[PDB]
Amino acid sequence: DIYIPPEGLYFRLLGFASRQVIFARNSPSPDVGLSPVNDQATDQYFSLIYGTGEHAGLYAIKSKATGKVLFSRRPAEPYVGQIDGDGRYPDNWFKIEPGKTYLSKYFRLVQPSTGTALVSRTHLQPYFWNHPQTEVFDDQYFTFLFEDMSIDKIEYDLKDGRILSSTPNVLATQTLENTSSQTQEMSFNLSQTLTQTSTFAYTAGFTIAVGTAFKAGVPIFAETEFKVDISVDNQWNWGEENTFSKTYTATFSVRAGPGETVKAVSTVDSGIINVPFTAYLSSKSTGFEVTTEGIWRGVSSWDLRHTLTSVT
Amino acid sequence: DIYIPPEGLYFRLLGFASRQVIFARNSPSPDVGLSPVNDQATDQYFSLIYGTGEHAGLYAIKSKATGKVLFSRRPAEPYVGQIDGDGRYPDNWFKIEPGKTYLSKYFRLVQPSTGTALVSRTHLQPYFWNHPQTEVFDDQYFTFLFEDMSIDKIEYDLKDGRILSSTPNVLATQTLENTSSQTQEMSFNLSQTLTQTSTFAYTAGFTIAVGTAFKAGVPIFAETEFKVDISVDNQWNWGEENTFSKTYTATFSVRAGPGETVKAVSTVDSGIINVPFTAYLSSKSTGFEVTTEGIWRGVSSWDLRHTLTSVT
Amino acid sequence: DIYIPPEGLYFRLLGFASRQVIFARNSPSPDVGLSPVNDQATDQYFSLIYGTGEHAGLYAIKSKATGKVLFSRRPAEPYVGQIDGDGRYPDNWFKIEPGKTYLSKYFRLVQPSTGTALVSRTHLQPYFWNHPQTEVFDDQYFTFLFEDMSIDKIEYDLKDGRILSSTPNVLATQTLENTSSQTQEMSFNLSQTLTQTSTFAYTAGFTIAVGTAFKAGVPIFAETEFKVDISVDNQWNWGEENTFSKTYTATFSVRAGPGETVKAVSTVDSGIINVPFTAYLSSKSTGFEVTTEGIWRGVSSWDLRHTLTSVT
Amino acid sequence: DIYIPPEGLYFRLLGFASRQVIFARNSPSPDVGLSPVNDQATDQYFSLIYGTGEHAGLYAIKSKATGKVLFSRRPAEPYVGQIDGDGRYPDNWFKIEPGKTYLSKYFRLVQPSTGTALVSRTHLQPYFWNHPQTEVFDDQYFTFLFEDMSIDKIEYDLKDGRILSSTPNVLATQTLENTSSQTQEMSFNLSQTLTQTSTFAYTAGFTIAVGTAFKAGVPIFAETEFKVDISVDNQWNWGEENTFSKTYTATFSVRAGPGETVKAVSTVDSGIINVPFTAYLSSKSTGFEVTTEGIWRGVSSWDLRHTLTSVT
Amino acid sequence: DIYIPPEGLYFRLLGFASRQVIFARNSPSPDVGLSPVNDQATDQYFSLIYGTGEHAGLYAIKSKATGKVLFSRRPAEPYVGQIDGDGRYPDNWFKIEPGKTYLSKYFRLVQPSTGTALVSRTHLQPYFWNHPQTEVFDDQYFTFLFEDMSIDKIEYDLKDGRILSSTPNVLATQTLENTSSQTQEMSFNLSQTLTQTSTFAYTAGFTIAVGTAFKAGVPIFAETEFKVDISVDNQWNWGEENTFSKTYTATFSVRAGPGETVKAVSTVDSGIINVPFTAYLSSKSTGFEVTTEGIWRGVSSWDLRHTLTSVT
Amino acid sequence: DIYIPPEGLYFRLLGFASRQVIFARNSPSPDVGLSPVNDQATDQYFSLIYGTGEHAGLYAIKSKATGKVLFSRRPAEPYVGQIDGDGRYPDNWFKIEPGKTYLSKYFRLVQPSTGTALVSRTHLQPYFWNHPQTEVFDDQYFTFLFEDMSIDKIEYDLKDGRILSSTPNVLATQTLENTSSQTQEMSFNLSQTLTQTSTFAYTAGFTIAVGTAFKAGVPIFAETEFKVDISVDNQWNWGEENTFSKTYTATFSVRAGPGETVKAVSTVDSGIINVPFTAYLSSKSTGFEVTTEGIWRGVSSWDLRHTLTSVT
Numbered sequence A, B, C, D, E, F: 001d002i003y004i005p006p007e008g009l010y011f012r013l014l015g016f017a018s019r020q021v022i023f024a025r026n027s028p029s030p031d032v033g034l035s036p037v038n039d040q041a042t043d044q045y046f047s048l049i050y051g052t053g054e055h056a057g058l059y060a061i062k063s064k065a066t067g068k069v070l071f072s073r074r075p076a077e078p079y080v081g082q083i084d085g086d087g088r089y090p091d092n093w094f095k096i097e098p099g100k101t102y103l104s105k106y107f108r109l110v111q112p113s114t115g116t117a118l119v120s121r122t123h124l125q126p127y128f129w130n131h132p133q134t135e136v137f138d139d140q141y142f143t144f145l146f147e148d149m150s151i152d153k154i155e156y157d158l159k160d161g162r163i164l165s166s167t168p169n170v171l172a173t174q175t176l177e178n179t180s181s182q183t184q185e186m187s188f189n190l191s192q193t194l195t196q197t198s199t200f201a202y203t204a205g206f207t208i209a210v211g212t213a214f215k216a217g218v219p220i221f222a223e224t225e226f227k228v229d230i231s232v233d234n235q236w237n238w239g240e241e242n243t244f245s246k247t248y249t250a251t252f253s254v255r256a257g258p259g260e261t262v263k264a265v266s267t268v269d270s271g272i273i274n275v276p277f278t279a280y281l282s283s284k285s286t287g288f289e290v291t292t293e294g295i296w297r298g299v300s301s302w303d304l305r306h307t308l309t310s311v312t
């Protein structure tokens, strides 16, 4: 089931074919049409009005710049445009039909009452028009290019963390710090770095744009639970694999035997790990709130061990 | 080696540049040209005629709507079009030259005899034309947009299943169901759910369109073999990672000692797993059959354990 | 931080919108403009001249075919074009502004002194023009389509290899080669094949084009170190997952007891593994050198074991 | 260091050679001499009077029947006998000289002041006499044949228990209680017996006679501590290995899956184990108290496990 | 409960004090008395006649040489001797009273009807006499010195074998048999000897004399069961620890890789083990049969492993 | 095969029955006879003269005090005694016939030429006599009561050490030495004592008297070999189980993390262990040398581990 925004969220209607966005303004000359994306052109933003009654399950597309609603009809010219009255006419209601395969994140905006589908193309004129809904062409598909949203918070569902793999990794094996006997001091210093992995994968809810940059603590396995490592301050990219460093540092000393050659082996458990999470976002322009569910996954390490053993 | 369809399979010739498909009809006015995809326009489908003799290794592109074959020549006008006689003229044979990098799933359709390459563009006219084969431009590349195929069957090669990782995961650890002694009944109920993973990756054979929706049992590791779990009835998307739930349920009771505090620990082995498979497909319009080889991979769980231990 | 080429490396400036490359020649008629990629058109290659002084942090875009530099101004017509003097005029310096989200691998070429941004479109004329830098449109973004580079060498940083997972896999379990007693010979032959995995992932440095084909040994885990398996001679594709076969073959015989039924179990450790690496490349036309850092990852196997045990 | 009884404990003086006990009575005719043991003849019991002053480290041997003390002199006849005054004369003090090898649990009773040693023989007359202390003969050795003591209590030092060995032992392996699916009940009954071991070994303190019969709980390993199993009510023999039965009984049922063949494997950890202990004894005739330290050792079992696993 | 022989088994009555055996003959002069053991003197053998009726629980001691029965009375002289009629007189019945501690394997032969106990001493005359049963002296104790019995068979209860400990022991670790590559032959020879242990401990039934020499196979652990190793042909001594050698020999060759340094590690599991058993014996003079239950225990080894691994 | 001393070793001939030793002197009156042991009476020591020629396999018993040899004949009186000429007469040669069962460490001294066996008794006169060799009585058995020997050295065959059992034992588990973060010092002190075991068991060679006290280092398992722990300075008793203390002491400190609660777990491997050995002894009076082979066995511990782990 594709994600359809609620009434207070704004978006751009990007065409698969034209690779351009629909615009609706009060001037210049042409009131509605297509244009290359310009994140600041209020012109290019719309929100939806959820149909009710006999329109339940349908939607009206409202211009943020004009407040007017889009329409699509086949008899009267022009076949498409704007109009007042938030869905006053049957011409303002559309059915959202998700595509398949390469068009799975796209959809047709079909207006039932007239059996017409919106068109967004650059090869034929008018670029923004409609077509008899029964003959499906690729240039009738649209995808949501949502407004800039800010990631306010990431909350992991730690109780459900899970370890997918685990192999011990010896950080500092070599350790032949010795003497003959009755010394008094032998200190060890551990400083090893492992390149870790991080990926925040979409599961459900609001469709955060792939690549969106943000910061958050990342999961860590303690000994019997998962915890959030707030130290990691790297910049992540939504839905993409990121890498970050994890350095293990430790200082310990050993010496109090009849005569030994102290040995220290620092070891950690490394492997793949994933944890569910919810992200809270809000509109930068409005503050409108939404959530997104996801699964975080990455190569990590845990259970740092220091084993001391004497030799003679 | 790119996948070239056999003689009975239909497809659309999508251009890298124009992002449009070639069409060949008997009318209206222009007989051949470019058009946005329309899965129902017979107009846009072609199949290949495998060259033989001195043409072995070359192909003729036959219109499904017209039966006519495409041609490409540089002296006589028009330089491209249709013509009867399934490869009667040397102008009907083409060499398929796979591209590299971003064009690896695309190819040029070069007609040797004339040293000309087909062209599919929208920036210059004619949109469907040809060019002296020696000067390679991006708008000379095409990719196969195969006909809608149905996935009739998935057959796993279970003998070759393989476990990539494995870590024990305790589903229900806590279990302090007690009394002092000589009770008579202490029953346990286990109900834990794990989010699993599923991906059907292409290996060879017919190139199933990424995203194609279908249903099939998914692999499972028994104790010494792999088996197909037919219960999982989720809808998969070819070549993409899907998730699904696996719930473990169990009821067992323990009590017959001198005086105990029965403890139950339910545990499973979880980790990554993959298994080879063959998919059998057939043309929805013709029933023409083909196969696709692939490797299925996913996070799974297995070997559910229930350990009972008394305490006093 | 996006990768900006040094002064001696050539590239094409591909537009996000137009999906076309900028060209600068001495003739025919129009000197600069847009064109579909043609890897042999010297016309389409440029290199950068690193600004210094008050221009430090800015760049001039030099035509490889003409030696002339690009410019962008808003008063005098034409607003864009070529000109001698490697950055003689303030009009030749540009600021490279990386985009975000879907435009993260793209950037604007803004000329500060005039507050103008280059434009690359096919929907409006002139196709190659500029726009008041303050109004950002999608057709103002460009990405680097670097010159054909050759991968001369792959050097792994073996000391940092790491095992992400590990599960024992018994290749040949069944082995009931017997007799009663005092025989004299019982030989075993092992021949098992496992499909392995290989991926060379970009980490930093020169951005090798995804898909680039090349050959190199692949990492292998010995017993206490990682080593390069030079036998694997498959063709890899940069930044993509490849598969390859690994066959284990072995012949051993056992017999010298009071009366036994020799059993042989061949086993290997399989799991995921990754190792850092540096790739050395050079321009095919110039020999200009660069490097790329990356992490190699794949499903592998190691520690082949043969265990013999008698039965009676 | 041999165990010398305190002043209130009674004993018999058994001779190595004569294999007979010393007696001291008021009548019949001969007042002191040798006799076969008769546990009821008060005649044969003596206790010691710890010398003090210049006699510190020496002892007087007091008759329980007569109260008189033994003496040994070489000039005046008879050379040995009884006499009043609890050590009034220098002739009443003896030095206890432990033997070696086969005489390690025996000792000479040498009277320094006169350089004479007591004699207990049956081959020459007088049977009970003395000899010039400088010429050591075997018939000058004695051992303590203590009075009947009762073992009132055994207290183990559980904190110091120790596991010497441990191997898992599967009690009930076979378990193929099945059906096809959706049954509802499958109960299991475990009843297995293991022959255990028990030995109470002397360490220090009062020398309990080997073989002495008594009853006490025996050590058991819980999961993280040792505990006393009070159920075992077998009769032990001090300082000797005893065996006893341990039966494990358990009843548990399992069934609540999509279709399984429930399997149950009952397992225990068996091995050698030992624990220190103190025994409290008291004179049956007097109630005089003493203690004995010892180490208990035996083959035991612990950590009974029940593992349930489904099959299909 | 002490072991009392059935009616057909012969024995000598050895006295604790006298350390001599009772004899009953028809001549010379003294008919009954004491004598140093002489295994061939029929004179010294007796068997028992189980009392019945009011004598149930009592026994008559019958001379094997004379057929006459022993008697004990206090009025008429002599107080002890022989007499016809297998228990005709009340004087022929005795109660067997086991001693404690050092006398636990000894017993008094008390004749109730007269309140008299048999006496066996060498310090007073008559050496063989009796005493008022109420005054217990050490020289009233006897032990059974059974007739020479032959151990016809040892049958182990293998199903109940048990492993008390287990630690892996590498027989032949070192193994660096190599070459560079493509050799063709590398054979290994294993010959290691371990000193094993063997003890047949009495549990119940006939009391086989400690030290009795005999031969039998000894237990061995296969892989899932215990088996009898019939190869071990050492001479055992009943109830005593014996040692014996176990040599592991094996010849195996390995070579068929791209280039290796074959390594072989031969390993075994060693530890303590015990198994119950029954011994079948019979009188050498009569063939009278009996059985003895026991537990066999010893340090053993099992599960010989040969692991081959290549190096480069 | 019983141990027969070589020609230069002295011993006493102790009788089973008489429990007395044979003596041969030049005066007083009776030249040969029996006597209670007196370790200083040269009178009681003899050595053997190995027969050769037709006497090979027989021995003469030579008096150390007199140099004369023992004899045994049945016609001429006295039947036994001394005589010059180290075996001059056939009467001086004896066959040593080991007994069985309770007489396995005893033997008859039979003089073939006359068919007579030596006798050692106290119940009949003469106490030291002989008897017609064909009628075997218990008082014809003798055992060797060797001269006082000194244990000069114990040499273990470390290469053959063997671990019979092994279970980890945590000495100091509890360890919650903490703070919040950035402290700087946290030191640990380990001091735990384990009661160990020691037994030197006879295997072959000279029969060292049971109980003989001596001192020697005891075996210890390092990590890959056995070594002698020379610290243990306890007094051992040949052929008997001894106990001794082993204390593990260690001081180590840990602290250098972002914020932790350092935990330390000290652990050791404990279990049963045995090692072969040879003992070198020599006569205290002569210095005559001999050796004894044996197996040392005991409960020990090894591989002390210190594991440090942080908590938060």
Ligand SMILES: CC(=O)N[C@@H]1[C@@H](O)[C@H](O[C@@H]2O[C@H](CO)[C@H](O)[C@H](O)[C@H]2O)[C@@H](CO)O[C@@H]1O
Pocket: A119, A121, A124, A125, A126, A129, A130, A131, A136, A137, A138, A139, A140, B035, B036
């Ligand atoms: C002004 C008007 O109504 N024009 C229409 C054309 O747009 C229409 O062309 C097609 O429209 C579809 C839209 O999905 C595709 O863009 C297709 O490529 C076009 O051919 C034609 C009928 O086909 O009718 C009028 O001319």
Ligand SMILES: CC(=O)N[C@@H]1[C@@H](O)[C@H](O[C@@H]2O[C@H](CO)[C@H](O)[C@H](O)[C@H]2O)[C@@H](CO)O[C@@H]1O
Pocket: B119, B121, B124, B125, B126, B129, B130, B131, B136, B137, B138, B139, B140, C035, C036
């Ligand atoms: C009608 C005709 O023959 N026209 C051709 C042009 O198409 C041709 O233009 C180029 O064609 C290639 C095809 O690969 C690219 O589209 C390129 O961008 C075009 O410039 C020119 C020669 O270049 O010749 C005629 O005009």
Ligand SMILES: CC(=O)N[C@@H]1[C@@H](O)[C@H](O[C@@H]2O[C@H](CO)[C@H](O)[C@H](O)[C@H]2O)[C@@H](CO)O[C@@H]1O
Pocket: A035, A036, C119, C121, C124, C125, C126, C129, C130, C131, C136, C137, C138, C139, C140
């Ligand atoms: C010749 C000239 O200066 N023309 C310009 C137009 O290009 C310009 O149009 C826009 O340009 C931007 C470039 O980022 C986009 O392509 C946008 O879609 C166009 O509308 C207009 C002003 O908008 O001004 C002149 O006509």
Ligand SMILES: CC(=O)N[C@@H]1[C@@H](O)[C@H](O[C@@H]2O[C@H](CO)[C@H](O)[C@H](O)[C@H]2O)[C@@H](CO)O[C@@H]1O
Pocket: D119, D121, D124, D125, D126, D129, D130, D131, D136, D137, D138, D139, D140, F035, F036
């Ligand atoms: C009455 C008296 O004084 N008699 C002694 C003997 O007892 C003594 O004999 C020895 O005594 C020792 C005691 O340790 C042993 O029993 C030894 O076998 C005896 O020979 C002799 C001197 O030896 O003197 C008196 O006769």
Ligand SMILES: CC(=O)N[C@@H]1[C@@H](O)[C@H](O[C@@H]2O[C@H](CO)[C@H](O)[C@H](O)[C@H]2O)[C@@H](CO)O[C@@H]1O
Pocket: D035, D036, E119, E121, E124, E125, E126, E129, E130, E131, E136, E137, E138, E139, E140
């Ligand atoms: C001929 C006769 O009846 N003599 C008895 C003695 O034997 C008896 O002596 C004791 O017998 C017991 C037997 O258990 C012990 O051997 C003890 O040492 C002896 O003293 C005495 C009474 O005591 O009576 C007669 O003399």
Ligand SMILES: CC(=O)N[C@@H]1[C@@H](O)[C@H](O[C@@H]2O[C@H](CO)[C@H](O)[C@H](O)[C@H]2O)[C@@H](CO)O[C@@H]1O
Pocket: E035, E036, F119, F121, F124, F125, F126, F129, F130, F131, F136, F137, F138, F139, F140
């Ligand atoms: C002086 C002499 O020759 N006396 C012998 C007795 O010793 C002998 O007695 C037996 O000797 C054996 C020795 O093994 C046992 O001690 C047995 O108990 C005695 O009976 C008898 C014959 O038996 O002959 C002479 O008297």
